[PDB]
Amino acid sequence: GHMQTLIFFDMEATGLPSSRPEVTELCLLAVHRCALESPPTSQPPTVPPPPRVVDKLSLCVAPGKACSPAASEITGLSTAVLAAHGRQCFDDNLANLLLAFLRRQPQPWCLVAHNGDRYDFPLLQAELAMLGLTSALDGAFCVDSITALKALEKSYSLGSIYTRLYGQSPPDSHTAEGDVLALLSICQWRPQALLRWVDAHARPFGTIRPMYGV
Amino acid sequence: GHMQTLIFFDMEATGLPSSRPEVTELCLLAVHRCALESPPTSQPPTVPPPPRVVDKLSLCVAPGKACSPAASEITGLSTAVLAAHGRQCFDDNLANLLLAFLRRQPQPWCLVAHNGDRYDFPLLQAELAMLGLTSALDGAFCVDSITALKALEKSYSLGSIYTRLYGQSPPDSHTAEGDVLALLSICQWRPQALLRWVDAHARPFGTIRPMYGV
Numbered sequence: 519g520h521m522q523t524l525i526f527f528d529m530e531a532t533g534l535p536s537s538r539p540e541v542t543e544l545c546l547l548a549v550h551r552c553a554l555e556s557p558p559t560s561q562p563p564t565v566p567p568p569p570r571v572v573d574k575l576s577l578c579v580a581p582g583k584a585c586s587p588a589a590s591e592i593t594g595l596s597t598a599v600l601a602a603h604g605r606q607c608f609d610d611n612l613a614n615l616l617l618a619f620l621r622r623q624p625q626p627w628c629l630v631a632h633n634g635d636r637y638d639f640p641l642l643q644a645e646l647a648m649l650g651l652t653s654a655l656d657g658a659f660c661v662d663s664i665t666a667l668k669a670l671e672k673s674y675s676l677g678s679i680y681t682r683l684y685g686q687s688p689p690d691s692h693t694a695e696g697d698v699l700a701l702l703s704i705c706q707w708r709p710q711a712l713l714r715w716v717d718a719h720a721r722p723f724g725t726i727r728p729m730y731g732v
Numbered sequence: 733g734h735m736q737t738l739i740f741f742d743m744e745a746t747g748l749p750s751s752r753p754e755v756t757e758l759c760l761l762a763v764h765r766c767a768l769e770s771p772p773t774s775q776p777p778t779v780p781p782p783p784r785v786v787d788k789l790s791l792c793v794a795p796g797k798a799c800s801p802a803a804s805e806i807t808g809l810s811t812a813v814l815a816a817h818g819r820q821c822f823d824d825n826l827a828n829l830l831l832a833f834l835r836r837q838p839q840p841w842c843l844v845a846h847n848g849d850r851y852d853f854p855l856l857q858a859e860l861a862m863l864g865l866t867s868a869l870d871g872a873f874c875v876d877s878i879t880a881l882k883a884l885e886k887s888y889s890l891g892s893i894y895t896r897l898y899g900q901s902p903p904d905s906h907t908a909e910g911d912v913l914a915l916l917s918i919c920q921w922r923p924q925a926l927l928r929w930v931d932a933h934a935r936p937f938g939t940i941r942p943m944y945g946v
């Protein structure tokens with residue numbers, strides 16, 4: 519069936535996959551398909567505005583180890599600073615919060631993340647597995663927006679794509695939320711085509727293996 | 733004791749208090765006291781940037797009745813449009829989501845809302861009461877930012893204050909999240925003074941009577 523909600527998704531972590539990383543930040547931006555299929559008329563901006571009606575969750579997370587120097591430089595986060603801000607680890611309460619947020623969205627749900635198959639999807643699955651919650655998102659679907667945007671269309675970095683589409687760099691905000699918002703803008707460029715591709719290629723989230731095990 | 737998290741808070745509703753309104757949108761922006769007491773140095777913008785580390789939740793809610801014409805004009809929401817986007821009502825799952833979000837923040841917690849004593853605080857209490865969750869936020873504190881900003885310092889509308897402080901209008905975004913972000917900016921103008929006032933005047937949320945009953 520047709521996806522009813524696209525949940526644009528990006529996470530920050532302590533390092534790249536080969537480091538056995540942990541989540542430091544996540545952003546979920548849930549957009550109803552109607553915002554892409556049937557956007558309201560206006561009486562012509564370079565970049566489409568976000569829909570008026572969206573659900574957004576952006577959370578920082580205390581990892582169980584230090585971020586690498588390279589990770590801190592690109593994400594703007596460090597374990598020490600997260601601790602100063604009283605952040606809690608990836609725990610049961612966080613999993614419940616994520617599920618409660620997702621349950622506010624009409625199903626089927628599709629997570630959309632840029633290079634999601636390499637980064638966000640396996641890391642989320644690994645974090646859930648460490649809590650013993652291996653099937654918590656079996657009901658979700660997912661797509662990788664790099665796969666989608668390649669098929670619809672070079673560098674396929676988010677910034678490269680955005681610049682090619684809108685003739686300007688995206689906002690200067692090196693955060694999970696900034697990345698989600700820029701991805702949404704890209705997905706609104708040709709929204710009906712994007713949505714058709716997602717509906718045709720959405721994959722069950724349960725097919726995503728965890729990045730790592732115990 | 734000193735408040736550890738300030739949660740900037742704004743809601744939209746179907747109408748003004750005298751209409752027996754229901755929530756249509758909410759935004760909670762949780763900021764650790766350290767972001768106000770001990771902001772990092774930089775090597776001088778007109779408006780302070782938001783802290784790198786924040787938690788944000790912005791949700792739309794299906795009310796059980798129509799929004800008034802006046803409400804729709806100022807909020808940009810209507811019950812019909814919320815329904816088209818598949819929004820769910822203010823229910824147990826929403827209350828649990830709010831509590832799970834708040835539980836990620838170090839206590840004591842203080843909600844900060846502009847004219848909160850008139851709008852946001854009694855309406856939140858009314859919504860919780862309708863679910864039979866009358867004590868769910870007894871552990872929280874709250875302050876009304878109009879009271880705070882008057883004491884620290886004319887029109888005390890958010891826009892009027894922002895313009896007086898920063899010499900320019902706030903961003904054009906008539907949303908709960910836009911209002912929270914502008915309130916945060918105002919609170920960052922003299923952050924140590926603001927935080928001292930909040931610590932001295934925070935009130936238990938349980939002292940807030942619901943806007944209305946059954």
Ligand SMILES: O=C(O)c1ccc(CN(Cc2cccc(Cl)c2Cl)C(=O)c2cc(F)cc(F)c2)cn1
Nearest residue numbers: 529530531532533534535539588589632637638641
């Ligand atoms: O195009 C994208 O959206 C994108 C690009 C890269 C990353 C990887 N990064 C950032 C990062 C880049 C460079 C060097 C370091 Cl050291 C890092 Cl740490 C993570 O934060 C990241 C890592 C993961 F393994 C799982 C994950 F979800 C997130 C995430 N997304």
Ligand SMILES: O=C(O)c1ccc(CN(Cc2cccc(Cl)c2Cl)C(=O)c2cc(F)cc(F)c2)cn1
Nearest residue numbers: 743744745746747748749753802803846851852855
């Ligand atoms: O300064 C502020 O932040 C502010 C100012 C006004 C309102 C009231 N409004 C907006 C509104 C303004 C004008 C006319 C209509 Cl008809 C409306 Cl409907 C609500 O949305 C509102 C109503 C409530 F009763 C409880 C609440 F939480 C929210 C909220 N906040």
Ligand SMILES: [Mg+2]
Nearest residue numbers: 528529632637
């Ligand atoms: Mg990413």
Ligand SMILES: [Mg+2]
Nearest residue numbers: 742743846851
């Ligand atoms: Mg308000």
